Amino acid sequence: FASVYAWNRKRISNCVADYSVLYNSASFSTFKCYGVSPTKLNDLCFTNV
Amino acid sequence: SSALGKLQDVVNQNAQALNTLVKQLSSNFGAISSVLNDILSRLDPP
């Protein structure tokens, strides 16, 4: 991974994102969503992640 | 043929008010957007 004082920054772009494989992976100890509740991610489109 | 300002003013006032009414459908009043399909199409029922 990358340090905390120089974090990384990847600019995901035009693609097919499946936040369900993330949301249900049960391997994550913390999964908070703020602007938008998690289950509605696989039904929206943005400009850049 | 070459003065009806009192009749023109009541038309203008009513139109200026009806436009201000519709132009308010695009203010947040302290919310994340002005569209219900953006608070709903991206937010839980709570």
UniProtKB/Swiss-Prot annotation, chain B:
Superkingdom, taxonomy of origin: Viruses
Coiled-coil spans in chain: 8-46
Effect ascribed to mutating residue 28 to K: In strain: Omicron/BA.1, Omicron/BA.2, Omicron/BA.2.12.1, Omicron/BA.2.75, Omicron/BA.4, Omicron/BA.5, Omicron/BQ.1.1, Omicron/XBB.1.5, Omicron/EG.5.1
Task performed by this protein: Subunit of the fusion protein that is processed upon entry into the host cell. Mediates fusion of the virion and cellular membranes by functioning as a class I viral fusion protein. Contains a viral fusion peptide that is unmasked after S2 cleavage. This cleavage can occur at the cell membrane by host TMPRSS2 or during endocytosis by host CSTL. In either case, this triggers an extensive and irreversible conformational change that leads to fusion of the viral envelope with the cellular cytoplasmic membrane, releasing viral genomic RNA into the host cell cytoplasm.
Protein name as annotated: Spike protein S2'
Organism from which the protein derives: Severe acute respiratory syndrome coronavirus 2 (2019-nCoV)
Lineage summary: Viruses, Riboviria, Orthornavirae, Pisuviricota, Pisoniviricetes
Gene name of the encoded protein: S
Covered residues, full protein: 939 to 987 of 1273
